Amino acid sequence: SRYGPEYKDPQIDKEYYRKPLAEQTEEEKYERDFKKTQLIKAAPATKTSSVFEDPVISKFTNMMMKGGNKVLARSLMTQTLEAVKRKQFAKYHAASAEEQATIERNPYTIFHQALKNCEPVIGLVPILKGGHFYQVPVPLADRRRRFLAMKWMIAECREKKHRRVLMPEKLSQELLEAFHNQGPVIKRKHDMHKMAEANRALAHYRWW
Amino acid sequence: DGVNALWGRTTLKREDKSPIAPEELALIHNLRKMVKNDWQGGAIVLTVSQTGSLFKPRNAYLPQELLGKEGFDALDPFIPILVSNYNPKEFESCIQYYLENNWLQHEKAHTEEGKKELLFLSNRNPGQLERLCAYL
Amino acid sequence: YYVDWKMLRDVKRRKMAYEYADERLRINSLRKNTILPKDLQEVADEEIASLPRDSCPVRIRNRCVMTSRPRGVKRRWRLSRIVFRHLADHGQLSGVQRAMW
Amino acid sequence: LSEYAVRMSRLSARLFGEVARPTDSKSMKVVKLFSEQPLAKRKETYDWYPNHNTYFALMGTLRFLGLYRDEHQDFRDEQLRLKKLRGKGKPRKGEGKRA
Amino acid sequence: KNRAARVRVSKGDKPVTYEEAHAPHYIAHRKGWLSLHTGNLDGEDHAAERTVEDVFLRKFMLGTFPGCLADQLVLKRRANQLEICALVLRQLPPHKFYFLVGYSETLLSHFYKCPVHLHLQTVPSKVVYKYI
Amino acid sequence: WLIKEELEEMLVEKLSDQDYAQFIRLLERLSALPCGATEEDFVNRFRRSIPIQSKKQLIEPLQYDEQGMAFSRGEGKRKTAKAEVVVYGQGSGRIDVNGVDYLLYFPVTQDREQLMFPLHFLDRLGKHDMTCAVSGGGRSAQAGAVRLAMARALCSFVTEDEVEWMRQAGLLTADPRVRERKKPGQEGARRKFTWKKR
RNA sequence: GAACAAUAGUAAGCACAAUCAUAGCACAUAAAAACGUUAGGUCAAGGUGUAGCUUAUGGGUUGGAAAGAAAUGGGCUACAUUUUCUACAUAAGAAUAUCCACCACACGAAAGUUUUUAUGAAACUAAAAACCAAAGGAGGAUUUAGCAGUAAAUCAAGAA
Ligand SMILES: [K+]
Ligand SMILES: [Mg+2]
Ligand SMILES: [Mg+2]
Ligand SMILES: [Mg+2]
Ligand SMILES: [Mg+2]
Ligand SMILES: [Mg+2]
Ligand SMILES: [Mg+2]
Ligand SMILES: [Mg+2]
Ligand SMILES: [Mg+2]
Ligand SMILES: [Mg+2]
Ligand SMILES: [Mg+2]
Ligand SMILES: [Mg+2]
Ligand SMILES: [Mg+2]
Ligand SMILES: [Mg+2]
Ligand SMILES: [Mg+2]
Ligand SMILES: [Mg+2]
Ligand SMILES: [Mg+2]
Ligand SMILES: [Mg+2]
Ligand SMILES: [Mg+2]
Ligand SMILES: [Mg+2]
Ligand SMILES: [Mg+2]
Ligand SMILES: [Mg+2]
Ligand SMILES: [Mg+2]
Ligand SMILES: [Mg+2]
Structure with missing residues (x-):
């Protein structure tokens, strides 16, 4: 790490600076940020103040990347959002009056909602006691649950897809499947709940 | 469309894996006779492109280098109409057109700030604008 | 006395190569050219191979001038890797210092 | 490539001194053989070895003349003397194992 | 453990001069x-003959002046003179010193x-930098 | 207060950490009481003044040349890539890098997002005409370098308060992350060869 | 052989520290790391103790050290669709293990056969092309590396 302990993470949100007069405690926070003369790290290349970005997209885009092809990973994430948009637009056209104002045509809304349904609620961690390993359920933290949902999405669409079907279209199908709570990822989430509920009497082993 | 391909070199090879001249192909040779100005009662609209070109650099777009010495030689005279990017009036019309079809589905895409970002990123170019609007 | 019998052999080998350097060059010119008749080139091959074995540039071996180590020798200083460190660590070589970056 | 270019290529070669007539890729090596110095005649090759015979002989004579005192040669002589005293020396010719 | 051109610590009774008291990684940092x-140099030839x-000379000067040499020589080459x-x-x-100076130069x-210059500086004893 | 090393050079005697802490605390008791003129002279001998501490940047004044109004120059460097940016405040929104349009020179959307970041933060996307000259590095190294140069060159046209906002966003701070060397005996900068235990 | 509201320890030497290098500082990385441990490795870098050889355990010439039943370590290329081929820097076209009335086909030879080139007195060494298209369809017990411009992917030069 070329940054010393004094350097801190920069603040990028423009709206945080343009309307500071409506609050007092937050004003004391950033006025002392430079009054303490604390050094600020350089702005990361990925994050930007553009209003069209989203933090959950960047993390998902990074995991899709293999090697160092950020261009290819960004290209795949662009097509997948387009592919989802095309399918929802077509379904909207062929619908009745009541069905028309039900379909969502916002890929970002679909993407955010899809991952919030693939996150497990309670995980498992092996614990060694008496020379044997017992799968003990634990209340997984929010960051772990969010990361675990993304990994399951990538793992499924990389392994059990056909060789002919492209990556952007295969991932688009699973997002719609997870949006309706019927995708194989949702099945895997329930399977982890099945094992956690089966070993509900082993929760006493953990010591935290 | 892609008149520069009627004179440039051809990737296709033969049984000896040796490149063939563009005049070997019958389709190009006969179509070549359809652009030499000798007949009456007709008009031909041409377009020199780069996306499908062979052995041409990405940056080159002017008619002379795309056609080369031979291509430009057998095309004079002509009227080199130049296609430009969007003007500020056109840019607003294209953006408003998508908003009428509910294409730009981002929450903040309806504001002027989103319009400024689209103008800067796309450089008011129709080709880049379509790619951006397809996923935002 | 050279430091080893191997070093003495190299001196004889280099000396023999120098004497027959020009004569080999003239004959080798005929072989390496395709415009001369093939009959003459075959005769040249017989003559070039009739020269003494030690008079061959490829048989010259680059050793260290101090300890005669057959390998691990820098060509610029003509010294073995062990001897080069021995001279350089004491500061006895100008402009040579431990690399730090 | 036209006949005009062939004359210009040859005419330029004539003035600057290169080969005028066409020459094969393999046939240009004979020009390279005489253009450059042969490997066996470079000063780096035949003068690679310092003349240890003169270096050793000169310091040998200066040692006997009292102008140069070599510790290392004195060490060998002192130890060689002790071996003779202990009774273990180098036998003469024809005395190793024939007796 | 590195051992290149180093003198090991042995109590506090062994004198060490300035040259011997610095490790080889100190070259171009504390000693020249x-x-x-x-x-x-970068684009200069004739480096093996100088070496x-x-x-x-490290072996000739050490043997010409037995015992009376203090420490290592310093060789400077300017133009063609040494x-x-x-x-x-x-x-x-002093009679023997001028004899050896005249003998060495010729x-x-x-x-x-090549012309040779031989400059001598006389010291009463070996200069001690540490220990002692 | 005096540093332990400085105090040892004032009393000409070696001290210890426990002794130094006790002495300083005693001065605090002396300084916390009502102060007399003689005591203040005694105390001030143990006082030391720190240098001026500030993180404000030096605003480069605007330059005018050959009827040219409101043009400033900036210097930026990031990951073996130096960028020279001069920005005119009297033109429309366009950037000319190395004699070519920026869109042609930066096909990657992310790279063109880096150039937007300084201008978009100040809401002056179309109010400045710029020409740039960047050399060395890859596509991202040049894009980051041009971003840094614009941030420093735009400080002239912007008020001082928003310059502080620029620093808090990380625009004005150079990126110290550079490629490391390859150690002798390792596959890369940190990766080592396979370690067979037996 | 220490108790800081201090109860026997003291000041110097080596090491750590600080400093220096990587052309600003900082951070980071290099560099450093004593006394000892393993009779650790090196008589074949060179020198040398002791022991041995001396018309021979020395010196020179010519020719020759093949070969892999099998086991294992470290690597390169792969087992493709985030892929292959071509154009070109990254907005393109085309191919795609299957269908079949016949055909013919993807990824992947670095290997092998033949031809040629480069070096050299000598090609057995290296490289290019043509032909050829095999194993391989993500790998058992077990195990290695990495904390940020790092892992990983890709490109280039130099030492001899
Ligand atoms: K021995
Ligand atoms: Mg020997
Ligand atoms: Mg040959
Ligand atoms: Mg050789
Ligand atoms: Mg690596
Ligand atoms: Mg200390
Ligand atoms: Mg430094
Ligand atoms: Mg440090
Ligand atoms: Mg180290
Ligand atoms: Mg240190
Ligand atoms: Mg042992
Ligand atoms: Mg061991
Ligand atoms: Mg051993
Ligand atoms: Mg020996
Ligand atoms: Mg042995
Ligand atoms: Mg001996
Ligand atoms: Mg023998
Ligand atoms: Mg095996
Ligand atoms: Mg290894
Ligand atoms: Mg490949
Ligand atoms: Mg394509
Ligand atoms: Mg194939
Ligand atoms: Mg192939
Ligand atoms: Mg092959």
Whole structure:
């Protein structure tokens, strides 16, 4: 790490600076940020103040990347959002009056909602006691649950897809499947709940 | 469309894996006779492109280098109409057109700030604008 | 006395190569050219191979001038890797210092 | 490539001194053989070895003349003397194992 | 453990001069090079001939002045002339010092075919930098 | 207060950490009481003044040349890539890098997002005409370098308060992350060869 | 052989520290790391103790050290669709293990056969092309590396 302990993470949100007069405690926070003369790290290349970005997209885009092809990973994430948009637009056209104002045509809304349904609620961690390993359920933290949902999405669409079907279209199908709570990822989430509920009497082993 | 391909070199090879001249192909040779100005009662609209070109650099777009010495030689005279990017009036019309079809589905895409970002990123170019609007 | 019998052999080998350097060059010119008749080139091959074995540039071996180590020798200083460190660590070589970056 | 270019290529070669007539890729090596110095005649090759015979002989004579005192040669002589005293020396010719 | 051109710690009774008291990684940091010449520059030739000549002088000066040499020589090469700077103890009578100076200057000049300069600085004893 | 090393050079005697802490605390008791004129002279001998501490940047004044109004120059460097940016405040929104349009020179959307970041933060996307000259590095190294140069060159046209906002966003701070060397005996900068235990 | 509201320890030497290098500082990385441990490795870098050889355990010439039943370590290329081929820097076209009335086909030879080139007195060494298209369809017990411009992917030069 070329940054010393004094350097801190920069603040990028423009709206945080343009309307500071409506609050007092937050004003004391950033006025002392430079009054303490604390050094600020350089702005990361990925994050930007553009209003069209989203933090959950960047993390998902990074995991899709293999090697160092950020261009290819960004290209795949662009097509997948387009592919989802095309399918929802077509379904909207062929619908009745009541069905028309039900379909969502916002890929970002679909993407955010899809991952919030693939996150497990309670995980498992092996614990060694008496020379044997017992799968003990634990209340997984929010960051772990969010990361675990993304990994399951990538793992499924990389392994059990056909060789002919492209990556952007295969991932688009699973997002719609997870949006309706019927995708194989949702099945895997329930399977982890099945094992956690089966070993509900082993929760006493953990010591935290 | 892609008149520069009627004179440039051809990737296709033969049984000896040796490149063939563009005049070997019958389709190009006969179509070549359809652009030499000798007949009456007709008009031909041409377009020199780069996306499908062979052995041409990405940056080159002017008619002379795309056609080369031979291509430009057998095309004079002509009227080199130049296609430009969007003007500020056109840019607003294209953006408003998508908003009428509910294409730009981002929450903040309806504001002027989103319009400024689209103008800067796309450089008011129709080709880049379509790619951006397809996923935002 | 050279430091080893191997070093003495190299001196004889280099000396023999120098004497027959020009004569080999003239004959080798005929072989390496395709415009001369093939009959003459075959005769040249017989003559070039009739020269003494030690008079061959490829048989010259680059050793260290101090300890005669057959390998691990820098060509610029003509010294073995062990001897080069021995001279350089004491500061006895100008402009040579431990690399730090 | 036209006949005009062939004359210009040859005419330029004539003035600057290169080969005028066409020459094969393999046939240009004979020009390279005489253009450059042969490997066996470079000063780096035949003068690679310092003349240890003169270096050793000169310091040998200066040692006997009292102008140069070599510790290392004195060490060998002192130890060689002790071996003779202990009774273990180098036998003469024809005395190793024939007796 | 590194052992290149180092003197090991042994209580506090062994004198050490400035040259021997610094590890080889201190070269060009605390102590300079005992010899300076053009051969080891970037685009200069004739570097092996200088090296072998340098080693010979390290062995000739050490043997010409037995016991009375203080520490390592310093060899400077300017133009085609060779300057040798030495530290010599007060051991031999001044008559012998001038004999050896005259002997060394003539013999080396006719051996390397270059003029030789021999400058001497006399010290009462070896200069001690640490310990003692 | 005096540093332990400085105090040892004032009393000409070696001290210890426990002794130094006790002495300083005693001065605090002396300084916390009502102060007399003689005591203040005694105390001030143990006082030391720190240098001026500030993180404000030096605003480069605007330059005018050959009827040219409101043009400033900036210097930026990031990951073996130096960028020279001069920005005119009297033109429309366009950037000319190395004699070519920026869109042609930066096909990657992310790279063109880096150039937007300084201008978009100040809401002056179309109010400045710029020409740039960047050399060395890859596509991202040049894009980051041009971003840094614009941030420093735009400080002239912007008020001082928003310059502080620029620093808090990380625009004005150079990126110190550079490629490391390859150690002798390792596959890469940190990766080592396979370690067979037996 | 220490108790800081201090109860026997003291000041110097080596090491750590600080400093220096990587052309600003900082951070980071290099560099450093004593006394000892493993009779650790090196008589074949060179020198040398002791022991041995001396018309021979020395010196020179010519020719020759093949070969892999099998086991294992470290690597390169792969087992493709985030892929292959071509154009070109990254907005393109085309191919795609299957269908079949016949055909013919993807990824992947670095290997092998033949031809040619480069070096050299000598090609057995290296490289290019043509032909050829095999194993391989993500790998058992077990195990290695990495904390940020790092892992990983890709490109280039130099030492001899
Ligand atoms: K021995
Ligand atoms: Mg020997
Ligand atoms: Mg041959
Ligand atoms: Mg050789
Ligand atoms: Mg790596
Ligand atoms: Mg200390
Ligand atoms: Mg430094
Ligand atoms: Mg440090
Ligand atoms: Mg180290
Ligand atoms: Mg240190
Ligand atoms: Mg042992
Ligand atoms: Mg061991
Ligand atoms: Mg051993
Ligand atoms: Mg020996
Ligand atoms: Mg042995
Ligand atoms: Mg012996
Ligand atoms: Mg023998
Ligand atoms: Mg095996
Ligand atoms: Mg290895
Ligand atoms: Mg490949
Ligand atoms: Mg394509
Ligand atoms: Mg194939
Ligand atoms: Mg192939
Ligand atoms: Mg092959």
